[PDB]
């Protein structure tokens, strides 16, 4: 809206109440929208036996299509926006403006790949609260989107040439961060819940679990085939909840033509790390904490007292 002349402001995308606010908003949206037939949540607050909370309810088959949310200033506050295209997420921004509201953000709940988001204006950008810490998530922001087309028939398609170029751009940025002499290796998820081991998303109201091994199986800047990458997918009914610890069960699909097409606009990665005298770094798809999803869009905004 209005650019602030000669102003320097500190931003911290990792400690941003806007992220927390959005998180609670999306949890609320999901409660009134995508209702499961059964939900289970543990309760072991007592000293002895546990008491799993079981809810059984009507579970209508509904289409689920994320709609843009605009966050405007909450009473008593203003929204500041960092305009620097290489802003690393934490520190002084010297090109700052006040805005009435954020851009339109689609609250896509997914793991591994960030879909239908905003692209970096200039070069690919990678962000972490602490790059040296292998347990902290690396948020990748692409500057060029890659189509991923999925069907309820059990697969997702990605153009191999486009993905190849994307990985090259990401690996270049990772080298910039971890060392220009380092080999950059992508590998499949090392394990955990099905929702974070696969590329997990919802399409046509259904929960997809796509095996992403083929996307993360390459070695870059080391020595010196199919036009389409086809990822096998499963639609599942018993789902681990992202909103809190628990499980939900949904009814089977009723549509024989479930088709989605999203743009991959970012990734969530983790680095293996560990003690090694080896000039190579291993990166695996990650995610699971949807706050990182919201962060990928809200990193450039901050709310301040007026």
């Amino acid at each position, epitope marked *: 809206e209005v650019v602030l002349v000669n102003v320097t402001e500190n931003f911290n995308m990792w400690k941003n109440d806007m992220v927390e606010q959005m998180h609670e908003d999306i949890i609320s949206l999901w409660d009134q929208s995508l209702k499961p*037939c*059964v939900k*289970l949540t543990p309760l072991c607050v007592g000293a002895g036996s546990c008491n*799993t909370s*079981v809810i*059984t*309810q*009507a*579970c209508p088959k509904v289409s689920f299509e994320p709609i843009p949310i605009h966050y405007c200033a909450p009473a008593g506050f203003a929204i500041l926006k960092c305009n620097n295209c290489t802003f690393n997420g934490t520190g002084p921004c010297t090109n700052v403006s006040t805005v009435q509201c954020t851009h339109g953000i689609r609250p896509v709940v997914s793991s591994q790949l960030l879909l239908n988001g905003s692209l970096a204006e200039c070069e690919v950008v990678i962000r972490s609260v602490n790059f040296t810490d292998n347990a902290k998530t690396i948020i990748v922001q692409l500057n060029t989107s890659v189509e991923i087309n999925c069907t309820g028939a059990g697969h997702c398609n990605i153009a191999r040439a486009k993905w190849n170029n994307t990985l090259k751009q990401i690996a270049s940025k990772l080298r910039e961060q971890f060392g220009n002499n380092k080999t950059i290796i992508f590998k499949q998820s090392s394990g955990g819940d*099905p929702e974070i081991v696969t590329h997990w998303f919802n399409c046509g109201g259904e929960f997809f*679990y796509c095996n992403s091994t083929q996307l993360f199986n390459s070695t870059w800047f080391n020595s010196t085939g199919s036009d389409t990458i086809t990822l096998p997918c*499963r639609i*599942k*009914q*018993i*789902i681990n909840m992202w909103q809190k610890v628990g*499980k939900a*069960m949904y*009814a*089977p699909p009723i549509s024989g033509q479930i088709r989605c097409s999203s743009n991959i606009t970012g990734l969530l990665l983790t680095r293996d790390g560990g003690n090694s005298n080896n000039e190579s770094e291993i990166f695996r798809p990650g995610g699971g904490d949807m706050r990182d999803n919201w962060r990928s869009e809200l990193y450039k905004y901050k709310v301040v007292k007026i």
Partner: antibody
Amino acid sequence: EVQLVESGAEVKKPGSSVKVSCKASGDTFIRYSFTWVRQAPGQGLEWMGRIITILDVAHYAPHLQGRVTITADKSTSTVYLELRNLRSDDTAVYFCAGVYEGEADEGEYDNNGFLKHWGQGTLVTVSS
Amino acid sequence: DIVMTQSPATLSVSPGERATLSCRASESVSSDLAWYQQKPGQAPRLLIYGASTRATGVPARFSGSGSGAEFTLTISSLQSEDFAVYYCQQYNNWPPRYTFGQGTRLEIKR
């Protein structure tokens, strides 16, 4: 395919409780849901309830709600039916039945309500 | 409470002839409808589920049709082993409150 073998006949006084069992053999226990159906002498089938074995979640017929409990021991592939505060009109043959639900351990669940596999039945006589 | 009604209560058919059994629901149950066969002293046997799908081991002479609130079980040519009691079962509701019809007894007409 699962084979269901039920426990032996029971004879109870009104006011008592009863617990009958059904051992499931031959397939993966958690890929099945199990249902109890009873049949009073000369009468039809009455659905009592069904357990989603993988979730350990059972649902019951409204007329029985409160005094029936269906449980499953995954370690022994055994399904249990407990009926409390027995009445003479609870006299019936009690059938355990089940149906394959899909690869439940992999999150696939069709939630089938029909019944493919049946036990041999357990006579429960309730009388003074 | 979904009520399942079967007719007739007793059907008498000459051996080798066609038998048609009816099941009606007090409200729509879509295609969530199963048919069972039961002989005296034995457990019920699943014949048809999903209104029209034959279960494994069920001969082709058994045929199920219908949807919504009206269903039919047809046996095209009655064999000696087909005389028994037949039950329909509704399993459409959620939370589940499944219900059975009161049965149609298929007996030999002589």
